[PDB]
Structures are given as C-alpha cells and as structure tokens.
Design a protein around this nucleic acid. Structure first.
Length: 223
RNA sequence: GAUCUGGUUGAUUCUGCCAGUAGUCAUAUGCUUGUUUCAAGGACUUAGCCAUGCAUGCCUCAGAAUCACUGCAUUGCAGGAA
C-alpha cells in the first residue's frame, strides 16, 4: 500500500481515533469518497471480496473496433455491511482494481429481524422488499429458521456476504443480464432501513455531527 | 429448497420463442452385472381366431341297499359301487 493523506473533513477524523465505526457515518448520512475510511474502520480478515462478472465491451470506429474490459466487484461483512461497484478499463487488471475501489464507497448497512418468535440473533430480513434495475426485478421474502437461501447463483452471493441467512426470492424480467440482476438484489437489501415499523417509532433524541463535536481538531489542521 | 442458464447486434437494454435441467409402479430399446429382501407382468393394435388337458360338486349316529360286490360270522353284522 501507498500512503493516505486525507483531503476531506471526514477522512481526518477517521485517520485518528474519533470515528471508530461506520455507524456514526451512516447515521448523519455523510458521503464516503475515500476508500481508506472503510479499510480503517473494518478489521482485516473479515472482509470478503469477489468478482461476480468480468465482460468485454466494444465500440465501433474506422478501421476496426476498440475493446475495453469491465468488471463487477462486491465486498462486505457478515455483521451487515455490503456494497457493489463496477467500472471500466482498457486493460484487465485496471478494471479489477477500479471495481474494488468503487465497491468500498457504496457500503450501506443492512437490517435483519425475525420471522416468528424472537430468540437468538436475527437470521432473516424483517419484511418483504423489492428492487428494480433495468427491466429485471427481484423480491426478497422472509422465511423461518433452516429454510436457507433459495435463490439463483447471482443473488445468493449478495445475500451470503450481507449476513442474511434464511430467505426466499423470486424475480421477473430478463434475469440473464447479470449486471442489472446484481444491482437489483443490492437495491432490495437497502430498503430495510427505508421502512418504518412499530419496533422503532419513539422520536429519538438527535445528536451533533462528528464535525461539530471534534471541530477543535479540524481548525488546527487548516493551519 | 416461494431459485435458473445458452442462442437475434459491431457493442447495449427489452419483448418473445427455441434449446438445456429434475421426477414419472410409464412404456419400449441398446449396453452392462457378484449377493439378499420385496413386487407388476398380452390393458394399449385385434371384445380378432383357437388344437389338447383341466376349471363344481356334496353322506352323517340321523332319506332310499338282495351289486349276481367285499370282509367277519356261517340265515346275521359292518363296509358298500352308481
């Protein structure tokens, strides 16, 4: 690795021990634009990467074609973090790198609940949801203990990395376009904190953004 | 186990069929085979045609005994065929 010097207010606060988790970030809903902030606050040997898809892309020109590779990369942790990203390069290893980097800036937390009696730790989404990308759409359905992941290959990875165990699924549209299939399943998971349930409502006391709190630091850093 | 993949373009997103995939006391047809338990089997086309043999008879203490029938006894007794 070649070293990090932060260009963001956020990044400074992460690079010293003030912000010690990604849930502080997630709360006040600040954007992450330096991949090193996800590296810093998530322990190593607990991230699981992999490449869902690598694929050629062309364009037409005079004399012949022009070729550019492309790639999809998915990343996350079984405590409820996941992201996805896809990018392009004119060589192979390029697109690989650029995907991984992208993916670590679309990290989003995932909420889990129960199907029935509340015992143990949550193994399943609390509700039905949907996502749509392109024509192809995806629906995720709660299921009881031991039901397991009943899904196609493509979705099953998304779910497994999230920390969702038992589930069921179904889809419509052309599911054979893989890039859209991925992104659909991703948009699905997101919306479990996008929906409001009697578990919550209470009008919680709200808190100041880390920037306000730690403002002392960031002033000195300017000088 | 409330699931999918390949094929229309120079490349992309759809619609839509074709092809792949798993069962079936559901039948046929090739290749192949060491032990044991269990079990369907001329229904599909022709409810078309049939050689030969067998497939429904029955007697007890208790309906009719002169077998010219059998045993024992010697003029009676017990079996008793068709």
């Amino acid at each position: 690795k070649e070293e990090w010097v932060p260009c963001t207010k956020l990044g400074r606060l992460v690079k010293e021990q003030k912000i010690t988790s990604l849930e502080e970030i997630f709360l006040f809903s600040m954007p992450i634009k330096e991949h090193q902030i996800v590296d810093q606050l998530i322990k190593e040997s607990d991230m699981r990467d992999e490449l869902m898809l690598i694929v050629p892309v062309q364009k037409a020109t005079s004399a012949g074609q022009r070729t550019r590779f492309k790639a999809f990369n998915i990343v996350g942790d079984g405590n409820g973090h996941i992201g996805v990203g896809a990018r392009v390069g004119k060589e192979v290893s390029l697109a690989i790198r650029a995907s991984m980097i992208a993916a670590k800036l679309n990290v989003v937390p995932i909420r889990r609940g129960y199907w029935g009696n509340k015992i143990g730790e949550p193994h399943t989404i609390p509700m039905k949801v949907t996502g749509k990308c392109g024509s192809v759409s995806v629906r995720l359905i709660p299921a009881p203990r031991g039901a397991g992941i009943v899904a196609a290959p493509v979705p099953k990875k998304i779910l497994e990395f999230a920390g969702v165990e038992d589930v069921y699924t179904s889809s419509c549209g052309n599911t054979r376009t893989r890039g859209n299939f991925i992104m659909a399943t991703f948009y699905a998971l997101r919306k479990t904190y996008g929906f409001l349930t009697p578990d919550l409502w209470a009008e919680t006391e709200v808190s100041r953004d880390p920037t306000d709190e730690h403002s002392d630091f960031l002033t000195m850093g300017s000088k």
